[PDB]
Ligand binder design. Structure first.
Ligand SMILES: Cc1cc(-c2nnc(N)nc2-c2ccccc2)cc(C)n1
Length: 291
């Protein structure tokens, strides 16, 4: 009853943290920028982890008996939240890049309306992908609970070929390679800006200060996505071993737990990274708690 205790502890924080982040945004209009529209998507997405994903994860750990639909949803629901975060993280990276690369067209292209539109699409795509095993790509009854109901065990009811090729390599690895690629251009060009402003016949500390702050946001964004791959790779890394190497010692249950748990942890690091990285955020939360 320790994995249960720890998982619960996480659930509370995930809820409190991101809910706080959502509230802070709702109160402080200085945080209601087009950029943070995606941050809320991250909040809602990661809140539901402690809300549902964690509850389900803890449940499916022991396994139960239910129909294929009901069993798949519970097993693949986590994929939706994890996939939605991908789009959010990617969008943010794009956003932070757009501003630095094209500050003038930033306001013309980055619209508070398009933000809401993209977010919606990301979620729709997240469900399609995250719940693709429900489209038929599953192992429900592949060579107890009785007819109709199936032993709901993640590894037994969810195809590995999907979790490796379609899910990881494509829906996770590729984006992370795109995101990382984006930040590459972000900082490379950002420092170029400073060099051009380094050879300017005028002070113009307004441009520098702004640029540095834009970079500070882009850097924070990088740290947010960085912690994502860092908390999910081990899990996929484990599965990559199990699949590509049937011979390779199948990951122990205890080690699998840790890797599984680490993924749930990511939802929590955000609220604290905002309070730490963003001086505007910390002061907002400080207000809420006190009052
Ligand atoms: C309930 C649950 C199950 C698993 C999980 N379990 N077994 C295998 N073989 N793969 C994954 C897995 C790996 C990468 C991405 C998503 C799931 C992970 C988490 C965090 N929660």
């Amino acid at each position: 009853s320790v994995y249960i205790t720890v998982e619960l502890a996480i659930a509370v924080l995930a809820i409190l943290g991101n809910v706080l982040v959502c509230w802070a945004v709702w109160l402080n209009s200085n945080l209601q920028n087009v950029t943070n529209y995606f941050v809320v998507s991250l909040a809602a997405a990661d809140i539901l982890v402690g809300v549902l994903a964690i509850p389900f994860a803890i449940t499916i750990s022991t396994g139960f008996c239910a129909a294929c639909h009901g069993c798949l949803f519970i097993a693949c629901f986590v994929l939706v939240l994890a996939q939605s975060s991908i789009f959010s993280l990617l969008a943010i990276a794009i956003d932070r890049y757009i501003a630095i690369a094209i500050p003038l067209r930033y306001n013309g292209l980055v619209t508070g309306t398009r933000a809401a539109g993209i977010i919606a699409i990301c979620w729709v795509l997240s469900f399609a992908i995250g719940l693709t095993p429900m489209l038929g790509w599953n192992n429900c009854g592949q060579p107890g609970c009785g007819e109709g109901q199936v032993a709901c065990l993640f590894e037994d009811v969810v195809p590995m070929n999907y979790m490796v090729y379609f899910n990881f390599f494509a829906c996770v690895l590729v984006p992370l390679l795109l995101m990382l690629g984006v930040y590459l251009r972000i900082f490379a060009a950002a420092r170029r800006q400073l060099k051009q402003m380094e050879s300017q016949p005028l002070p113009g500390e307004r441009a520098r200060s702004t640029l540095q702050k834009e970079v500070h946001a882009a850097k924070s964004a990088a740290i947010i996505a960085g912690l994502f791959a860092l908390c999910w790779l081990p899990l996929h890394i484990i599965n990559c071993f199990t699949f590509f190497c049937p011979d390779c010692s199948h990951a122990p249950l205890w080690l699998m737990y840790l890797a599984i748990v680490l993924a749930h942890t990511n939802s929590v690091v955000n609220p604290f990274i905002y309070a730490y990285r963003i001086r505007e955020f910390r002061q907002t939360f400080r207000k809420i708690i006190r009052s």
